[PDB]
From a paper:
Here we characterize a novel cystatin-type protease inhibitor, mialostatin, from the I. ricinus midgut. Cystatins are tight binding, reversible inhibitors of legumain and papain-like cysteine proteases. Recombinant mialostatin inhibited a number of I. ricinus digestive cysteine cathepsins, with the greatest potency observed against cathepsin L isoforms, with which it co-localized in midgut digestive cells. Mialostatin localized to both digestive cells and the gut lumen, where it targets cathepsin L isoforms and regulates their activity during trafficking and processing of host blood proteins.
The crystal structure of mialostatin was determined by molecular replacement using the structure of the tick cystatin OmC2 as a search model and refined using data to 1.55 Å resolution. The hexagonal prism crystal form contained two molecules in the asymmetric unit with a solvent content of about 57%. All protein residues could be modeled into a well-defined electron density map with the exception of the first nine residues, which formed a flexible N-terminus (Ser1 to Gly9), and the last two C-terminal residues (Asn118, Val119) of chain A. The final model consisted of two mialostatin molecules, chains A and B, containing 108 and 110 residues, respectively. The molecule adopts a typical cystatin fold (so called ‘hot dog’ fold) characterized by a five-stranded twisted antiparallel β-sheet wrapped around a central α-helix. Mialostatin contains two conserved disulfide bridges connecting Cys69 with Cys82 and Cys93 with Cys113. The closest structural homolog of mialostatin was the salivary/gut cystatin OmC2 from the soft tick O. moubata with the highest sequence identity (53%) and lowest RMSD for Cα (0.86 Å), followed by salivary homologs iristatin (41% identity, 1.56 Å RMSD) from the hard tick I. ricinus and sialostatins L1 (42%, 2.09 Å) and L2 (40%, 2.50 Å) from the hard tick I. scapularis. The interaction between family 2 cystatins and papain-type cysteine proteases is mediated by three regions, the N-terminal segment and two hairpin loops L1 and L2, which form a tripartite wedge-shaped edge that binds to the enzyme active site cleft. In mialostatin, the first part of the binding site is formed by the N-terminal segment around Gly10, which is the first visible residue in the electron density map. The L1 loop (between β1 and β2) of mialostatin exposes the segment Gln51-Ile52-Val53-Ala54-Gly55 corresponding to the critical binding motif Gln-Xaa-Val-Xaa-Gly conserved in cystatins. The L2 loop (between β3 and β4) is characterized in mialostatin and other cystatins, except sialostatins, by the presence of a conservative Pro101-Trp102 segment.
Residue numbers in the entry: 13 to 122
The structure:
């Protein structure tokens, strides 16, 4: 069902930033996205995006009450710290976006 899409499309990069913004458990800092590696899509009820991207610790402390954004939450260092896959469910005609899954592994080539 999954159709490959162009991972340089900024619409897909912004969905990856949305996904990282939802991940707070066990952290002091938000992660942020370094690179979107892969995007696949499927239409089931809504429009679903399966994103694979690298992350690293951002400079944004979660408990400061800061809103996550790509601009503010820059990487502390340019080092890959995780490779993550996240599925996002959307209903474009209702402006709904929901992270269904988010899982990461450590980079095996650092």
């Amino acid at each position: 069902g999954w159709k490959t899409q162009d991972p340089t499309n900024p619409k897909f990069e912004n969905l990856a930033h949305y996904a990282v913004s939802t991940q707070v458990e066990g952290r002091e800092y938000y992660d942020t996205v370094l690179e979107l590696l892969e995007v696949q899509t499927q239409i089931v009820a809504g429009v679903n995006y399966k994103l694979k991207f690298t992350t690293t610790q951002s400079t944004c402390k979660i408990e400061s009450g800061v809103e996550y954004s790509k601009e503010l939450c820059q990487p502390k260092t340019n080092k890959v710290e995780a490779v993550c896959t996240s599925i996002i469910y959307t209903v474009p005609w209702q402006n709904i976006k929901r992270v269904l899954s988010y899982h990461c592994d450590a980079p095996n080539n650092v």
